[PDB]
């Protein structure tokens, strides 16, 4: 009759139909994903279309029940998941423009090709060919070419699309009674319990930049050690006290440093853990891998698999001809159906990925008794944090030695621990400042603190300041370097990896304390521990039906985010790196760049300064370079694109340097450019109508 006597009937009607429509949509999506063909890509637009229409129709009807005058937490929180619409408050033209923009950025990122400066008939996509060069190549010039060919043939295409995307997303999020698109991304980590003591959207930024200040010494020591080991290779290219160049970090964006492990390996004589050969030699297959993962999950007390997991979900490459994209993922189809789609091999990393995906399944199996709107992780960090923390215990060489893969004669000295911890820190510690800096840049761009004419300037300023990474060549406002990454061009939240790492190590410390582990945290196995399984399973079942702070309190005995478990995990590595970085410099200065020593400072003493005068200056510099090299019997066609401008203060001064055409690594020496300017000093400022005192050329 009244409110709270009809909203539960509305949610009873919603759940018992949303379950069926979501199951049909998930069945169609699985049938496409394992059987990519023409007739299977057509069936999401006949099932997901009805699911989206039903979701928006029930979201419109949910607004008739106010969030006031309802007291019980689950139905009120289900109405909170509803009411907030799946139908944006945005114009039809603006919504169509936003969809076109997102499709354009996805197409440009997916089909962007970078060609070599000499013989331009071969070009490389990002995933075939450029990621290979970013991962495996130790050549400076090839890495710089692949780093600058990207973000200039692709990022320059993504700059105005990203500007209009930012405008349209801010307009869309302001219609959801938020302030920013970054604030709308922070609709997660938003709880209310009693007396206004809940977790706010603004509390997340304070928590993350407190955690970032708490990880500063460990990351600084890791950065100093990586910089020291990046001087054995690349001599005369990395400053001992400066920042690291952006193209020497193991991939395209410097996200993960784990490809720098062969260059920065400690004790290279000691072999690392690799059970792949014993995995093949014992006749293992995919079924054995997943049965051993299920045996690991049973041993802590978590249940078996649903027996439709073994039948419906594929666990190998399909022998019959069926096109599949082979990306490990775990499927929660709904209605009690759980599946894993991955093309696993007999490999140690495939073993750990199988543990990861089965951890996702076991987290999905727990909250199946919750209502459909609350069948998710309590925040966007717990789900992947559980996934990664379930694979930490089995990667240790005591769980591997129990299964028989590792020989009992393997030496577990204190050097292999340092090798494992440094590989982990390259994977884990080296990606936290990057994640924090990228999400801070996106939050300040959406908030409006970074103007549209200072996107790249602020981006590289806080990349130098926070990450400790310097650009190898200057990028003006025509570039868009964040958009060159997948998660930025495809409109994905990115702080979930930061919170994933924090919650993963917090859960690891809690479960290892519960399981009565004695030694260090990195050598901990939570296997054969029923007590850890009980405390684990009482958190997976809650789903979102409870605030994330109070379900974090029930497992780690702290409502807030803590990084103390993470610093205790890498404590032997931290005290080893303190000893290693004793005669070296720990920290960086944001003044050094690879073009810093060969750049000429120019000061302006006033006729006016538009962007049409910068082009004139660059043309005059290029013509002076051509004239100076013409008298040296070296005909080189210097252009505007070969003159780079850095430290651009549009009122007083800027820096510039000249690069040889067809070779971005070939910076012209500073004496050559100064000699060119002195030779052609008349017609480098006769067009500007100013004497040599106005442009002093320091």
């Amino acid at each position: 009759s009244t409110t709270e006597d009809r909203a539960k009937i509305f949610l009873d009607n919603f759940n018992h139909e949303a379950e069926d429509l979501s199951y049909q949509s998930s069945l169609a999506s699985w049938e496409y994903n394992t059987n990519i063909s023409d007739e299977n890509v057509q069936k999401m637009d006949e099932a997901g279309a009805k699911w989206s229409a039903f979701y928006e129709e029930q979201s419109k009807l949910a607004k008739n029940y106010p969030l006031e005058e309802i007291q019980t937490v689950p139905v009120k929180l289900q109405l909170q998941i509803l009411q907030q619409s799946g139908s944006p408050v945005l114009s039809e033209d603006k919504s169509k423009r936003l969809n076109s923009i997102l499709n354009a950025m996805s197409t440009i990122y997916s089909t962007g090709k970078v060609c070599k400066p000499n013989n331009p008939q071969e070009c490389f996509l990002l995933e075939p060919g450029l990621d290979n060069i970013m991962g495996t190549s130790k050549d400076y010039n090839e890495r710089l070419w692949a780093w600058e060919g990207w973000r200039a043939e692709v990022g320059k295409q993504l700059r105005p699309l990203y500007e209009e995307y930012v405008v349209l997303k801010n307009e869309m999020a302001r219609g959801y009674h938020y302030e920013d698109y970054g604030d709308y991304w922070r609709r997660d980590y938003e709880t209310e319990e009693s007396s206004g003591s809940g977790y706010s959207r603004d509390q997340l930024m304070k928590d993350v930049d407190r955690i970032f200040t708490e990880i500063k010494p460990l990351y600084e020591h890791l950065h100093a050690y990586v910089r020291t080991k990046l001087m054995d290779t690349y001599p005369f290219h990395i400053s001992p006290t400066g920042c690291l160049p952006a193209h020497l970090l193991g991939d395209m964006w410097g996200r993960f440093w784990t490809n720098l492990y062969p260059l920065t390996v400690p004790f290279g004589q000691k072999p690392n853990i690799d059970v792949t050969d014993a995995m093949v030699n014992q006749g293992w297959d995919a079924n054995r891998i997943f049965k051993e993962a299920e045996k690991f999950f049973v041993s802590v007390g978590l249940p078996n698999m649903t027996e439709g997991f073994w039948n419906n979900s594929m666990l190998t490459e399909p022998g019959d001809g069926r096109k599949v994209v082979c990306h490990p993922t775990a499927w929660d189809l709904g209605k009690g159906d759980f599946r894993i789609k991955m093309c696993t091999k007999v490999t140690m990393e495939d073993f750990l990925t199988a543990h990861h995906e089965m951890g996702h399944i076991q987290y999905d199996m727990a909250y199946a008794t919750q209502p459909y709107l609350l069948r998710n992780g309590a925040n966007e960090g717990f789900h992947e944090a559980v996934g990664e923390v379930m694979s930490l215990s089995v990667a240790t060489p005591k769980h591997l030695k129990t299964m028989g893969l590792l020989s009992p004669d393997f030496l577990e000295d204190n050097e292999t621990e340092i090798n494992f911890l440094l590989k982990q820190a390259l994977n884990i510690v080296g990606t936290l400042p990057f994640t924090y800096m990228l999400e801070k840049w996106r939050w300040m761009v959406f908030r409006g603190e970074i103007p549209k004419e200072e996107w790249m300037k602020k981006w590289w300023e806080m990349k130098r300041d926070l990450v400790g990474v310097v650009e190898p060549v200057p990028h003006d406002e025509t570039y868009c370097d964040p958009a060159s990454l997948f998660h930025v061009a495809n409109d994905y939240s990115f702080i979930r990896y930061y919170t994933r790492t924090i919650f993963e190590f917090q859960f690891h410390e809690a479960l290892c304390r519960i399981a009565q582990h004695d030694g260090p945290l990195h050598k901990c196995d939570i296997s054969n521990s029923t007590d850890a399984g009980k405390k684990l399973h009482q958190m997976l079942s809650v789903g979102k039906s409870q605030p994330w702070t109070v379900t974090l309190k029930d497992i780690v005995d702290s409502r807030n985010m803590d990084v103390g478990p993470l610093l205790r995990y890498f404590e032997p590595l931290y005290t080893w790196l303190q000893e290693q970085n004793r005669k070296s410099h720990v920290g960086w200065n944001t003044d050094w760049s690879p073009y810093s020593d060969q750049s000429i400072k120019v000061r302006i003493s006033l006729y006016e300064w538009n962007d049409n005068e910068m082009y004139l200056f660059r043309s005059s510099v290029a013509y002076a370079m051509r004239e100076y090299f013409s008298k040296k019997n070296q005909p080189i066609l210097f252009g505007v694109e070969n003159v780079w401008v850095s430290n651009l203060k549009p009122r007083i001064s800027f820096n510039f340097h000249v690069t040889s055409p067809g070779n971005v690594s070939d910076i012209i020496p500073r004496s050559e450019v100064e000699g060119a300017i002195r030779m052609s000093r008349s017609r480098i400022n006769d067009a500007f109508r100013l004497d040599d005192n106005s442009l002093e050329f320091l």
Binding site: R6, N13, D20, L27, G308
Partner: protein, 186 residues
Amino acid sequence: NLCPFGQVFNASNFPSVYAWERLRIDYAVLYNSSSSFSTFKCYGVSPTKLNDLCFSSVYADYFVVKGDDVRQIAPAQTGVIADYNYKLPDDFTGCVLAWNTNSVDSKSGNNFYYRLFRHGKIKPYERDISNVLYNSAGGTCSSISQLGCYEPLKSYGFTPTVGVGYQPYRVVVLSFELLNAPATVC
């Protein structure tokens, strides 16, 4: 010679839970059955030592519920099936039998239904097959494109890949009076 207790366990089809039927109306076929039962909960009389207190009338209510809904067919239970679909008395005597039929009742393109919405709870042994739309306030809306009116009969939506808990279960409930004896069957 003859004891009619079959033809209700080997029937080619069962109705939905809201449309259960009875029989007017041999107990060794429960143990050595064609299908091994998943639920053998018997209340009042016991399965072992059963054919000693003879009964003059036996009712066999048969229907199909969800896998998780088998728990709700028992005396003194609260649920959607108990409140709106099928109710047992608090002093019920007899056995409740169920078995999985995912290979049979979920293969076809047919549908099984259950009354999610009703105006008040249901009495024991009361059958409700009305298709009248349910309004939250009251009365008859006669318009699904409104606010507060929903379809009462919801669908189980059986698929052979749902897994245990959402799979079809054929439930046959045997109920006895334990006090009615006009000296007919003994």
